[PDB]
Amino acid sequence: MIQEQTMLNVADNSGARRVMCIKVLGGSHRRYAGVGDIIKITIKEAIPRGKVKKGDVLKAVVVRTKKGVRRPDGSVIRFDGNACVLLNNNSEQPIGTRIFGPVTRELRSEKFMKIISLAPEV
Amino acid sequence: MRHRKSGRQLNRNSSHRQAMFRNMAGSLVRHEIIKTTLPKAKELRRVVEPLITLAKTDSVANRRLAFARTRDNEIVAKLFNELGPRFASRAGGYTRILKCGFRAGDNAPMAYIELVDRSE
Amino acid sequence: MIGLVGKKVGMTRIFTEDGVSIPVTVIEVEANRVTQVKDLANDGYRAIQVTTGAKKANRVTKPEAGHFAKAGVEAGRGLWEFRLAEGEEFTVGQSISVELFADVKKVDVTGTSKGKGFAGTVKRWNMAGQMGNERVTVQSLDVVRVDAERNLLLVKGAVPGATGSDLIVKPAVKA
Amino acid sequence: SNIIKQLEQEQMKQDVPSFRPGDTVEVKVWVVEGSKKRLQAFEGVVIAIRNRGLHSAFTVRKISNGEGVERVFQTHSPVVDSISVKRRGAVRKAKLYYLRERTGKAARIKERLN
RNA sequence: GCCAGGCUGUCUCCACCCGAGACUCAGUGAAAUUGAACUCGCUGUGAAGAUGCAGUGUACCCGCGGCAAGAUCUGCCGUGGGCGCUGGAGAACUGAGGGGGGCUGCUCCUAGUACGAGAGGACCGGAGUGGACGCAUCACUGGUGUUCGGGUUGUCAUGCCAAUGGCACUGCCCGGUAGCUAAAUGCGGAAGAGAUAAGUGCUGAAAGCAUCUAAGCACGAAACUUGCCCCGAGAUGAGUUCUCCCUGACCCUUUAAGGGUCCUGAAGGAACGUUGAAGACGACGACGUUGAUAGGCCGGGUGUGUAAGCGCAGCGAUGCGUUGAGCUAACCGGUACUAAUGAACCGUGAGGCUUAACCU
RNA sequence: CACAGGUGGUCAGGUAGAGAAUACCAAGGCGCUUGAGAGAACUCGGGUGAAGGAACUAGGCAAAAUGGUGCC
RNA sequence: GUGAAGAGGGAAACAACCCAGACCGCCAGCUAAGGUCCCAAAGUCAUGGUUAAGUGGGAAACGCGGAAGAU
RNA sequence: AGGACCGAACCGACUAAUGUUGAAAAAUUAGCGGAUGACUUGUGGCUGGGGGUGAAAGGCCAAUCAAACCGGGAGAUAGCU
RNA sequence: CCCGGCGAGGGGAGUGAAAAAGAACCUGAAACCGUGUACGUACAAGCAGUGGGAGCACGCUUAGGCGUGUGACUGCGUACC
């Protein structure tokens, strides 16, 4: 779960290090966004040269949540922190071909069939 | 709130209540009879009965534990020697409470609490 | 159709073969024998009175003892009514087991919420008044497991009333 | 009461070994992929044990890609297949929530040598 | 003067815990205001928003806790004492009426389907899955859990070491029993039904055409109401059903819904105790020896973590086997060991008059 | 008013402490003049807490984080 | 002309609208304004006409329409 | 040696809250400032009311001061309640 | 003399014309506080009164419908300066 104005760890080779949330989407008058929800984040630090520039505003999706998510069998997946990967409204395919840390099994969505291939460590 | 919780409030500092109960238990052991309010008498019984039950078994660790919650060497010595064998046959229910009207000072209910044997 | 009165015992999880954990609340359903029958001709409507549990003879009022003696059954801990669905009737003393819920797959639970003291305006409507001890119903619940020989009923989710409370389980009207 | 105790105990399998907190352990988990099921091995260190009847669950932590991931495994759930202890540890602390900050040598623990 | 960063419930959302007030028991106890009050809503008028004027409607009398729309009063929610439903009493309900909400996105098959020259392209509202509200719950995710356990600095005390107890915010922290908790999980915005606007229609002229209508005469919007739950016979129009109890005597008078005396004291309730996941006080639930209602005890479980002592090693810190040991409040199954005694009080002794059908 | 307020100077121990500040004790003085009750909403003084440290507020106003020695 | 300094009855209430100037008492009769379905005292009285919309029981200019009025 | 700094006692109300009933007719809690300088206080005396005092706000002089209390002129005076 | 606490206060006896004169001491009213007596009121809306008014108790001409105590209901009634 992620709230407004929360830092998300970067799990892609785009060069981003610190990203801040600005707006939350995925439901009218919604206060929190889950792991499988689209969020609006910005960039605080950028590499000297690359496709990502400071101040850009674009969509993103959380891959890991500090609070975690539950399972039908009662199991809970909890991570040491919140990790998010930037997404674009057009050309959803993220630039990063490598993702830090494992990922859960809830990424079977229609548009997330291309990310399960990455993240070899589960 | 107020659902399945033990321990009457007895509005006071927690350490103050603990010291109060220590004094109550020590007095009851020393004199085998007390004349105190029922709300305090119930918790006095609840806190003192474990002490006598533990004292029924004689051991260095048991004596040290009894002294920890008693802080009176003479009272601890009184235990393990007279009360332990006196109530050895009985298991639980080492105290009895008899109402003696309401206190005249402030209309506060008051009652006597004493051991089952209390003598002999 | 017709509901039965049971006693809440607790709630836990049930593990499925596929590996899914489901909350289950446990209701003890004693045989709720019928004491009296109400009809249109006499009482103005069709209904049957159900009783359950046991009451000590000393703590049973003489009028209730006479009523149960007329019913030809031992005195229970309470009486409840259930409106018939215009189906087959019943007879006095006809014990009813949990088998009726063995093929429903959808039940509704009515009971009294746990009591609470005075509640503030924020605590109530987010004015102040008593909380709990009020009839409340939760509908569209599916039974998980039925054990007729053990008088055990497991229902998904949560139901009003803590342990030791009495509740009513009725066939789900909505479907 | 008796009924709930019977219901809880009737679904208990006497196969989980007794592992102390902070002891390295491997867990086999059934995972559904496509229309089939397969096995997955998860190695970690047990941090907390909360054995509430059949609700018994233990937290296992692992370090992957430089990040710490902790998952709670249910002791008696069908999803968990078997529990095996590879490296034996010894810590005089029921809960190991303190190691979330430690790393490298500090996070390491000594052999039990019982 | 300004910038970058770390840093707390200021907030999404607040949740829990410790103390003094808030409520009851025994006593002391003043004020501001006060013409008198048997101190209702709406409509119209009025020196112009009427508790007091005309019309209309509702409301048993009197108390306790707050929400402050105007804390004395009006008003609202919850809950109490008295009273009547006509002999009394205990239960179960029908129900005149009353509380409220009927929200909303994505995907799936339908289906790249009908239609459509092609382009284009659904009705579907059937299934699954989100967002916000309410209700329910603590097994799960955790928070709290100063009443449980352990680490630790200073100081005092137990004659001293060891070992213990108090104080220093719970002395500072690490975990956590039960209860409560949302950030956790279960369900609901029904389906169907009635009347429906527009609109869609069988035969059809007057006025050999035509037309929703003149004659026969049919469907239908997410709009409205039932359907969904909850309170409800103080509904004084005071309801319906079941069961139980009383089956004595005598005297007087102003001779009748009369009065009085001895005996009787039924069912039930209240009175008091254990008390509760019931509670501010009331009230409510279970029990009161013919018992698991509270405490303690046995065993288990949870939690904490290898207690003290013993003997070995290091001349010391400390470790080793005893010892997965000791302790464990609120959890679970038993145990009468302790506390709920025998009782007293109210509540009565066949139930008012008239009418109509029955056996007499 | 036996009120919660002001009233001038002196006597100045031990422990850990740079310290007459800080915490417990020595001799000494006191438990302060309403007590007891289940411990509701609510008010006041505090403690902990998942996603955050400034997204409420005109406002970093309360609270909260560190609080030093020598060197690389 | 009224109130000021005049009551009473009617207009549902109402001080300037209509009748009407209270010496006091009486369980008497007759009238002014206003009424004679009830509330509430009086005709559900008679004759000749308008009304199908509760217009009566709120409305102008204008071609029955105009017409929208106060929890 | 500091209009030197942190920091006790001590002093100032500079700010927030408690109340204009009262505990106080100017007080309480907290924060803040000074804390060897331009400081404070123990005790005694002096500056008297078109006068004293005053870094001027026309501030203060025993419930206040901008003409204090006491007794009198005066049971005053104009309008008005 | 007794109750009461070896008090305060009260109850008897006596003195005292009188103690319905007891040191709170001639005469003792209303506001205010209590008991008893008779009546009305718990389905009933507003300056709380005025006429009608059955009923509820007492004494009267021993009925002859009289007065006192209350006023269910009913027409009217928007305080004083």
Numbering used by the authors:
A (entry chain K): 1 to 122
B (entry chain N): 1 to 120
C (entry chain D): 1 to 126, 161 to 209
D (entry chain P): 1 to 114
Pull verbatim passages from the article behind this deposition:
To elucidate the underlying molecular defects leading to the accumulation of precursor particles, the most immature states from the Api137 data set (d126_(L29)-/(L22)- & C_(L22)-) and the control data set (C_L2) were compared. Treatment of E. coli cells with Api137 disrupts 50S subunit assembly, leading to the accumulation of precursors lacking density for uL22, akin to an uL22 knockout. While states in the (L22)- ~ H61 route do not appear to have the opportunity to transition to the canonical route, states within the (L22)- route, such as states 3 and 8, can do so.
These data suggest a second mechanism for Api137, wherein it disrupts 50S subunit assembly by inducing the formation of misfolded precursor particles potentially incapable of evolving into active ribosomes, suggesting a bactericidal mechanism.
